[PDB]
Design a protein around this ligand. Sequence first.
Ligand SMILES: NC(=O)c1ccc[n+]([C@@H]2O[C@H](COP(=O)([O-])OP(=O)(O)OC[C@H]3O[C@@H](n4cnc5c(N)ncnc54)[C@H](O)[C@@H]3O)[C@@H](O)[C@H]2O)c1
Ligand SMILES: NC(=O)c1ccc[n+]([C@@H]2O[C@H](COP(=O)([O-])OP(=O)(O)OC[C@H]3O[C@@H](n4cnc5c(N)ncnc54)[C@H](O)[C@@H]3O)[C@@H](O)[C@H]2O)c1
Ligand SMILES: NC(=O)c1ccc[n+]([C@@H]2O[C@H](COP(=O)([O-])OP(=O)(O)OC[C@H]3O[C@@H](n4cnc5c(N)ncnc54)[C@H](O)[C@@H]3O)[C@@H](O)[C@H]2O)c1
Ligand SMILES: NC(=O)c1ccc[n+]([C@@H]2O[C@H](COP(=O)([O-])OP(=O)(O)OC[C@H]3O[C@@H](n4cnc5c(N)ncnc54)[C@H](O)[C@@H]3O)[C@@H](O)[C@H]2O)c1
Ligand SMILES: [Mn+2]
Ligand SMILES: [Mn+2]
Ligand SMILES: [Mn+2]
Ligand SMILES: [Mn+2]
Lengths: 384, 384, 384, 384
Amino acid sequence: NTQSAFFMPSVNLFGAGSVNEVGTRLADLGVKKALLVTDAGLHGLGLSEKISSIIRAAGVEVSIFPKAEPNPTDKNVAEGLEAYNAENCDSIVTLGGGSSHDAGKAIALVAANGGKIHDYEGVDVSKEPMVPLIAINTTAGTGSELTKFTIITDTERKVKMAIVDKHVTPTLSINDPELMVGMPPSLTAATGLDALTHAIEAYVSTGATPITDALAIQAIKIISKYLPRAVANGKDIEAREQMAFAQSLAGMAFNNAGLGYVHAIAHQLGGFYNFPHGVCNAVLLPYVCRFNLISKVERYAEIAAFLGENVDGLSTYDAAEKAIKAIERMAKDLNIPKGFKELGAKEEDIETLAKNAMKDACALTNPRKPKLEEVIQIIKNAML
Amino acid sequence: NTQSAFFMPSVNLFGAGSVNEVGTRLADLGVKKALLVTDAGLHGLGLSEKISSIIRAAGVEVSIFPKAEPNPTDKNVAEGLEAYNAENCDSIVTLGGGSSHDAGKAIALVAANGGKIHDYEGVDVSKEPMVPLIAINTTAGTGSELTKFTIITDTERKVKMAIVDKHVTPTLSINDPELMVGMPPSLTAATGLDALTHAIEAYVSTGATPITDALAIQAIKIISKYLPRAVANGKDIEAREQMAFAQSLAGMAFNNAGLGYVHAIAHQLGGFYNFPHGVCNAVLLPYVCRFNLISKVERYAEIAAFLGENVDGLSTYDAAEKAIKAIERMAKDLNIPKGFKELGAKEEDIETLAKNAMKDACALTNPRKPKLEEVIQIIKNAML
Amino acid sequence: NTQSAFFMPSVNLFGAGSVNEVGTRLADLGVKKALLVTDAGLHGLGLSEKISSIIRAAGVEVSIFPKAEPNPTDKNVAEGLEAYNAENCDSIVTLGGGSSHDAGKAIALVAANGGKIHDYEGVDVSKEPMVPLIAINTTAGTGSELTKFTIITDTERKVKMAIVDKHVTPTLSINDPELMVGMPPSLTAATGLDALTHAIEAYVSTGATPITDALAIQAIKIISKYLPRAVANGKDIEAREQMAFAQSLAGMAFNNAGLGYVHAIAHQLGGFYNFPHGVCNAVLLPYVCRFNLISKVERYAEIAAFLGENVDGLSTYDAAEKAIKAIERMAKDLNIPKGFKELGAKEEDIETLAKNAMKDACALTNPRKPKLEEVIQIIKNAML
Amino acid sequence: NTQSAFFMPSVNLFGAGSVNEVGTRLADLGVKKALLVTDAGLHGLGLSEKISSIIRAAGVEVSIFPKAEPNPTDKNVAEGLEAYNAENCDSIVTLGGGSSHDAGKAIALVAANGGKIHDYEGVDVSKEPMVPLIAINTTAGTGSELTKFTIITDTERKVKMAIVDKHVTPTLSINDPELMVGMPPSLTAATGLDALTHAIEAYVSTGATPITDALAIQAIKIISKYLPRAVANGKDIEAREQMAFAQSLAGMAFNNAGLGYVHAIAHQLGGFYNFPHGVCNAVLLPYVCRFNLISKVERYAEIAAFLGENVDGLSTYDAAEKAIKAIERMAKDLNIPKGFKELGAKEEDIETLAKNAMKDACALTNPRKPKLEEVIQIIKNAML
Ligand SMILES: NC(=O)c1ccc[n+]([C@@H]2O[C@H](COP(=O)([O-])OP(=O)(O)OC[C@H]3O[C@@H](n4cnc5c(N)ncnc54)[C@H](O)[C@@H]3O)[C@@H](O)[C@H]2O)c1
Ligand SMILES: NC(=O)c1ccc[n+]([C@@H]2O[C@H](COP(=O)([O-])OP(=O)(O)OC[C@H]3O[C@@H](n4cnc5c(N)ncnc54)[C@H](O)[C@@H]3O)[C@@H](O)[C@H]2O)c1
Ligand SMILES: NC(=O)c1ccc[n+]([C@@H]2O[C@H](COP(=O)([O-])OP(=O)(O)OC[C@H]3O[C@@H](n4cnc5c(N)ncnc54)[C@H](O)[C@@H]3O)[C@@H](O)[C@H]2O)c1
Ligand SMILES: NC(=O)c1ccc[n+]([C@@H]2O[C@H](COP(=O)([O-])OP(=O)(O)OC[C@H]3O[C@@H](n4cnc5c(N)ncnc54)[C@H](O)[C@@H]3O)[C@@H](O)[C@H]2O)c1
Ligand SMILES: [Mn+2]
Ligand SMILES: [Mn+2]
Ligand SMILES: [Mn+2]
Ligand SMILES: [Mn+2]
């Protein structure tokens, strides 16, 4: 059979200032009091208070829960669920990067299906649709405000538990590039290379569609041109807005086409060592592309053109090669770490990271199907 | 402002056999009785009955309403609404092309808001969302199963009214290429060329964004390869599936970018003479493009590349002209009327047609702003 | 000798909202009362009351003189001059197109040089800096807010006279594209093609310089991309902003390199028939460029490429030919009159018109030097 | 806001012999005793006397202050201010290079505004326009007869302070290539590469406009053809005239677009070690361009073609790198030192150099925003 499906929230706001609608949009759902899920950093910057003011003007109450953590944890879910129940909230607003979107998605699911966030690992292992949720995005790399994914760390197993589930698609998303201006360069760089990774893995996924293809291609072309600008000058407003679009394009593509062994492996490093997700993808992306080359050489040749390379006079193989050269050059230019050893990864952990990566759902749509020793080789190469 | 927004059903099913889900999807919404809106043609072929038994086996009842006409009228909508109440319905399933979809959306909207369908001509007039509706698409050209559009003919004024309303986005859409094999050639061509007009007008709209751009580009490239194949052999399954993707992409593109004076004028020629919608687009498209050229010359030149033209060693202006020639050649190859006069249009109407087009919501995003006299000359050219 | 000079106001303001500075700016110049020289149309639209309040909110007094007529006249100058004294003003603020700039420069010059504006036809014949004057520009074509020219129609010999004096350089110019949005399409086209004429005549003028060359090349390139956009949709702010820049590059270039026989002839048609200055240049431009060709063949070839033409594999001669085809095509697409006879030009005037063109200052820098029979033929070709 | 402004002296004279107008132009101002600010070498040449003879031959009194030193000091400005009051001058005439123009500008401004020159470091500090000033320019590189910059060394801090102030735009400029023929090759090279640094940083500046782009592009093209010629044979009169146009095109460009980190860092190496400003720029230029590359890669690719490189079949990035190789090549050919250590800079000073560089007003328009650590890496690269 050849069926496929496309999912995203039914209303999706973009552009400078769109965050000011969160109040009146929340009232429109007839919710009374929302739990505002965010993280400590943005709470300290005061972003949680600016948004909470907007929501309360519209007559909707806020309880602020700034305890979601980079690489959100099952404990954050349990703790925020308690604060959801304790403060009599009927909705969730998320405010931040993908960590706040996924914390809030877990809380909103479990507040309507009951057990623990581990009940629902895998694919549509759920029952009811999650409680009303508006996702306000502030990094330019995840797309989690658009996706049916929620990535939650299992703290006793050391593994980022991918939860794929139609019930966690947000009600409404908001993508306001004015809230992204204050990303430091290194956060700009890594979330941006997470978007690029989404776009490239979605383009080469076995679950790719002409719709997801259309989005992924646009995302790669934009990122290629505007991500190094946004990193060099976070106050370049044009680059911020373009990255906000690219982020959403890549999120819509991967949500519906699937990822690959870049995310499969990056999820394990993130669980063992709590690395930044986006840095893990940037480090890994060239090695997985290299391994995948022979299964998708024409698509990698086209990525090489998307990334601005000149492929005139070359074989398809040689043009695919230039896509990897260009990814490497972009990583070096954005000051991405050279490998995982210098960050703290452990030689003795490589086989368990490999084995766990082959269990990740993101591995299912990788165009090349590896054996365990090949996955190990990819992690070894990324140690450099 | 520079704000914008992207709208779409939350869930959109694709691929061979995806109609089998309509009963259980309907059931999950908790509705008890659906009014099945289709047209006499599909009803005669018995498609109407296969779908009803699928819905019934899931516990939802069905009342069939096979009285949506090509270019659905206000009278169709009023009759549908009294069927809807008489048969104690709480939901709507539309089955067929864009006449079924729009008829059903209009019934659904009036059921939720009172008044009459005429009251909602314009942009975001209604207070309440339409009642639950699932759209099953049997043509490869409208995208109405995805859009906040519904086109209802005011029969006193002979105007196909454009109702553009967030509140008429279907709950869920189904796009089954197996239901599309039966289109005879001239229907394949007319709806395909409606899709190409969606993609072209979206691409040159002043409401274009990089998201809508991505979708429109892919639609044009796919249509240019596969539409002539679908017209040539309706049982070419790969062309049917590609066109089902192309028409969805173009739907998403125009739904969020806007249309232009092709649709604003076609709606008057359709309101006056009941011509097929995609035949009106096909006749007008080269004239409105030629007229729009100076405002979007670089985008028309790119469009010539997407359609396969060779623009080597040409000015942008000369390249854009090859795009009009390519559109003209495609129309001629699929047997479109070269003009309207041979179809029965009357010179004395032209002033009224032109004045009605300037009130259509699609005029709002056309990239060149015309004086009434310029609209008049465009129609007069389209006569011959 | 090979000396040369570059003149312009010492401060020039650009960008949206820059008009809000005219008041504070004026007061910092230490003046009390400004005679606001505008024309009837912009006074009818309320503009000279937006400006007038701004100048008053900064504690400076305004006396609106809305009597400058298209193709300003020795009478407007005299009547504005006596308005100047009677009302006890010490400064001029021009607001409008070239007509309002030129009226205010004439009033301000003769307000510090006693006599009558006739007393300064020619070159630098004034003997005193003109009264302090701030020029607020609202069309995109004459760059008079930058220049040392004022063109006053001698209602006598019916010839637009030239007072080329360094004393008429405005004190400070303001160039706010928001004020330009109101221009209707045909005013946008004609001021735009006058800007393009400025840029081309400056580029082929025997008075050219590497500096004027740099400005003219940019103006030609910008106008070629954005003037058709500005005509097609006056609400395209980007195209409005680019045209404001092109306007000033062309002004700065021709003000310091000189013009040629396009303006030399067009000044005669404007004195005899009061035709719009911009339209005169538009019709004349391709015929003079044809005549000028053999004196400047490489530079017209370069203009062809600035205007978008592809010139690979062409002789310099053939490339220079495409500059003229492209200028004609652009005149056709902006609905410029095809010749002067349909405007009201009389066969019996061609001799006087040509003899008078030969006495125009602008004739002096034209690269080809015509005998009287040759000017007469140019005027015949532009009658069609 | 998109607001911008273009500043420039109202009258600017060019060409051989133009310096013969200085007296009549100083007379037209109505001033009586001008302080003639020059340096020791031009004084001993006889240029101070020749010019004073012209100023006196038409009724104005001259008093020669020949004490401006390369990299003018706060003490020079103090001493020259005491001379200004001693002889009780009402004006100033600067004669020579940037050292003389900035000495005079600083004197004129403190004369008009009060305290000491250190008060006005930064942007638009002062309250009053400086006293009348005519700049006669004798090097082909500063453009400071045109600009609102004056660069005065704080001798305690060893900081060449950038005073960027509308109020120091000279009343009139004279740019006479006959006074430039005597530049010895090393000085021709250094002033020429300073002007190249002005065009390049103006072109990549975040303050660039279409106007400044026009000027800067022309400068680059002319410098790359004629600067090598002027160095190879200073009696080449054509190269001398071209270089006089390019230095002014570059002055107009950076004056209004802004500079970057080449000048921010150069100002500290000149303040600490009193190196010639142009040699400092030439050393830093490749390092800062390569740092800036990712933020302005399209524009650095254009710069490569402007400098004559062939870029066919190259990515934008590889094209941009060719620009840097061409920049390094020109410096090598004109005998500029490879680094700052052979000149006498010391590693122990680098931390203080970088911190002060970040306080320089020229840093604000650099297209990439550095951390202190990145400014330190640039200075270290430049030591070798
Ligand atoms: N479910 C999905 O669709 C999906 C997809 C990709 C990644 N993820 C998950 O998302 C997480 C990564 O999220 P992320 O990379 O967006 O970052 P994040 O949410 O982990 O945030 C990291 C840091 O960035 C800061 N920050 C965020 N926005 C900021 C702004 N505008 N200005 C200043 N600081 C700001 C936060 O305060 C925080 O300290 C991982 O857990 C990853 O697994 C989910
Ligand atoms: N709301 C929107 O987004 C939107 C967009 C474009 C057009 N429209 C409207 O849609 C209408 C046109 O719809 P359409 O062109 O899809 O056709 P349609 O709904 O008017 O149907 C045309 C004919 O085709 C037949 N048909 C449909 N599917 C068939 C199949 N699979 N096999 C055989 N016969 C089949 C029908 O029985 C009918 O007789 C117009 O009224 C137009 O204005 C709406
Ligand atoms: N440097 C110079 O001195 C110089 C150069 C070229 C031409 N000119 C002279 O300038 C005049 C040409 O002026 P012009 O072509 O700019 O037009 P204009 O000043 O003659 O005005 C033309 C018409 O346009 C209207 N208008 C102007 N700005 C408008 C706006 N923003 N919105 C709506 N309507 C607007 C005016 O009300 C008027 O009715 C002629 O006299 C010509 O000879 C002078
Ligand atoms: N816009 C600005 O304000 C601006 C821009 C760039 C540089 N500057 C400053 O200008 C200064 C550098 O000025 P410069 O490089 O023009 O030189 P300079 O004024 O420092 O003169 C250097 C030496 O060249 C000699 N010289 C000058 N002209 C000569 C000629 N025609 N023939 C023979 N010898 C001649 C002088 O006598 C002097 O000894 C620096 O302090 C720099 O910071 C200012
Ligand atoms: Mn990711
Ligand atoms: Mn349509
Ligand atoms: Mn003109
Ligand atoms: Mn400098």
